[PDB]
Amino acid sequence: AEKCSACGDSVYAAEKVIGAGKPWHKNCFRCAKCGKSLESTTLTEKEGEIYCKGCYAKN
Ligand SMILES: [Zn+2]
Ligand SMILES: [Zn+2]
C-alpha cells in the first residue's frame, strides 16, 4: 500500500504526497505531460500517470 512505484522504494508516512491511494515521494513526484517538479494543493493524477497541476492550468 505504502510504496512509491516511481523509484520502486517504499514510502515513509509523513513525507510522501498521496495521489489518492497511490503514494509517491516528494522528489519522485514528476509530471507525465511536461515532466517537471510538482507538489500541489489539489494535485492532478490520472489513471494514466501523475501530472503537474500547471499542465492543466496552461491547458
Ligand atoms: Zn520514490
Ligand atoms: Zn506538467
Curated annotation (Swiss-Prot):
The LIM zinc-binding domain, residue ranges: 4-55
Compartments where located: Nucleus
Its biological purpose: Interacts with zyxin. May be a component of a signal transduction pathway that mediates adhesion-stimulated changes in gene expression. Totally down-regulated in transformed cells.
The protein's name: Cysteine and glycine-rich protein 2
Stretch of the intact protein here: 117 to 175 of 194
